[model samples]
Target chain A: NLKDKILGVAKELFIKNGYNATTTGEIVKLSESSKGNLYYHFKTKENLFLEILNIEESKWQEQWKKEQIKAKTNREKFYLYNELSLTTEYYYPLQNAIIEFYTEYYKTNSINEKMNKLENKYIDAYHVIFKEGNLNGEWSINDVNAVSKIAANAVNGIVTFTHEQNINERIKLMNKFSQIFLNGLSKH
Target chain B: NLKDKILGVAKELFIKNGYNATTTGEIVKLSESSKGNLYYHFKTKENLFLEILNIEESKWQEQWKKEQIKAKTNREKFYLYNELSLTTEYYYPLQNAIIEFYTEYYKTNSINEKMNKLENKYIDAYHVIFKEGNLNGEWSINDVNAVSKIAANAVNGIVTFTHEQNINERIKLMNKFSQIFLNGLSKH
Candidate 1:
């Protein structure tokens, strides 16, 4: 709980000041915690940073799962995922930090299989949502797996691309994509 | 000469330190130029930053004009523009900086017409290319504008998306989109 408080302060600071701009001393000072206590729990500055990201990612994925359950059909599921992709700028940091983290993580040789597993899970989930829509004639698309990959990549690109620029325009463009892709895929 | 040196330093620093993380002091130190010189040339940090971008955008447009002249037909122009979109990502600091800059710019404006104007320029250029291609019997497709728009957006999305998480996977996805959109648009 104390560690959470420390991380909470650091996250707020990092968001405002950016990752490199914020310092560990400030995080400690803001949290009203001693350096020893911070390191005792988090080990290093990078470790603490990753822990903050881990917590943030878990919260995000949990919310997404909740959204998925709220949607009644595959079309809705796909749409919701499209919408969720836009929130990274508002809710999380820009895409570059995560990309950089993964790049380093890949070099470590520990999380490769785990990361691949997650990618496969996403591809499969996308296929299910897409294929179900197609089968119901509510959506018309082929190569469910490939289309799933396309949606995933496009959404990611749009989010990262627009992260630094315009949220509303990005959202609008993303919405256009959802409409265009869905319209093209659906037989209606 | 000094302005070019400033821009070159700014570009390198922007890429290495990121836009926000970079400071004018570091830039001055890197260039061995006085703060007075930088301020005298550009009123504020923002002005200097935008100047670099304005210069870069014009250079890109100039290059496009040269390429357009070489194209024998409109379709060739359309395809050349498609390739140009991909090359935008390769410009490193400029590509990333512009994406971030435009995103913020879009947020402030929130004008649908502005967004349309920005996105539609590509559509218009692509239309010219496609019209010529069709006349030449190089390809037969209706709504070349819509197809080109999707292809453009999709390609842009993939480049921006993968920078966050999956590099290789993004490449594969990008390839798939090119194949799908290009093949689908190809003439018999």
Candidate 2:
């Protein structure tokens, strides 16, 4: 329960102050626990922070798996994936985490491992839908590898633009970027 | 002499350690200045950092002005602009400055204002090239404004990518991106 309390407060602080601005002392203060108590459960602030990310990531993964499985066909799976990206509760948190850690994470081998895992997880999930579509002759993609790279880059570019200045219109902006990408990569 | 010494040390430290990890104490110790002396010149670390960014930006503006005036024709100006970008002295310092103040300057209204000035400066200088090309029937661009926006975006996107990664193979990547962009936005 104490460990859970510490994580809860850490998540709250991360959302409010951002990852870089946050500190272990602030997390302890918010949790109303001693530094010893917090550090006993989590070796360091980084360890705790990674745990928070993985916890949130797992929730969405479960939801996504369930939704994809429920979909009747590959077309439906694609629609569901897009819908989930827009509607997921953890989308912004995950986005923020990616931006917060991407550069630094890529520099270190440990973080790169996690980054590679997370990236592969999403790419593999998407590939499933693409496979189903291509197998059924519904999608005519020349190179799945190239399409995946474009999809990832386009999404990154779109998110990067939408997050700048005013983010109130992110949904609208994301939809526009997604439409452009989907059209370019579509079966037609 | 004291200011120059401090700035020299600051530049090295800032580039190596980053702005956040760098401490005023380190600056003081390196410059052989007391806390009072450091504060007398630069009130806060943030202020000191901004001063460094200002130095870099002023150099950029001065170079642009000099190049623009020296070019015999608009086409020469355009080529000169890209030529400058290819140089290490012009490119590296600017890229370093961007990385140094990226976190703070991005949030400042100053960045937006400076972007406009930089964009206008480039267009004004390079438009001579496009205009001359048009007069000679070498090129046909209907809207200079739209072309200018694409040019700015392409330069900016490449610069951003360069800063995020190393200069390793960046010349090839930048050239390819610029070529693709110029092709897409060509008036023909």
TM-score of 1: 0.62
Which lDDT tens digits does candidate 1 get at residues B1-80? 77778888987766554555558998888887889998887788767776665566556667788877877755455556
- Give lDDT per model, in order: 0.61, 0.58
Q: Kindly report the docking quality category of candidate 2.
A: incorrect
List candidate 1 segments past 4 Å from native. Answer: A86-128, A131-146, A160-174, A186-188, B1-51, B68-82, B88-93, B97-155, B163-188
TM-score of chain A, all candidates: 0.76, 0.80
lDDT of 1: 0.61
Q: Please give, for residues A1-188, the per-residue lDDT of candidate 1 as tens digits.
A: 76887988887775555554467889889899888889999778767766676576666667777778989887788777777777543334534444433433544555445444444555566778788778777866656777787777666655554443466766666665565566445432
The candidates' interface RMSDs, in order, read 5.1, 5.9
Residue lDDT tens for model 2, B1-188:
78888877787776555555568889889998878888888878876876776675567767877776887755455545654664534323433334334433555667656544544565554465566766765556776543443344334434433343346454544444333333332333
TM-score of each: 0.62, 0.60
Candidate that would win on lDDT: 1
Query: Which parts of model 2 have CA positions greater than 4 angstroms off?
Result: A63-112, A119-147, A150-154, A164-168, A182-188, B1-5, B8-16, B28-37, B57-188
